[PDB]
Chain A
Amino acid sequence: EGILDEIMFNHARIIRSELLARDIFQEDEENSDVLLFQLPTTCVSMAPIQLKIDLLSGQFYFRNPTPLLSNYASKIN
């Protein structure tokens, strides 16, 4: 079980590091397993959204996804 958990975490970290290398998601200092995506909620607002990786099946998910956000998360999956 520990070996499987280590492999899971390593694969997730490798994918996250590739995404950071592509410089699409900024780095989250508070959480090493949370990716920050910059999106403007309004004309002047410019806010980050937290995307997380499922440790079991590995599909990206949002913290409070809107219907469009959920649809595009499914598209990402």
Chain B
Amino acid sequence: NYCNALIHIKFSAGTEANAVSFDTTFSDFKEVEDFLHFIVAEYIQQKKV
């Protein structure tokens, strides 16, 4: 609508080329930061396992 910001996030885990692990939409930057932090923590845990 020329003013609102919509962020579409597609995170594909390293399992398959088409098995999209997560695909979400966001309109609040705060939730964007929260989900980014959660994804970073999940990646760190995956690297720790």
Contacts and interface: CB of A to CB of B under 8 A. Distances in A.
Q: Is the interface of A mostly helix, strand, loop or mixed?
A: loop
Interface residues of A, number: 5
A41 B27 contact: no
B30 interface: yes
A45 B27 contact: no
B26 to A, nearest CB: 11
Contacts, number: 10
Nearest to A41: B30
Nearest to B1: A67
A66 interface: yes
Interface string B13-28: 0000000000000011
B47 to A, nearest CB: 26
Contacts of B27: 66-67
A66 B3 CA distance: 11
A4 to B, nearest CB: 31
A66 B27 CA distance: 7
Given A41-B31, A45-B30, 8 more contacts: A41-B28, A41-B30, A42-B30, A42-B31, A42-B34, A66-B27, A66-B28, A67-B27
Interface of A: 41-42, 45, 66-67
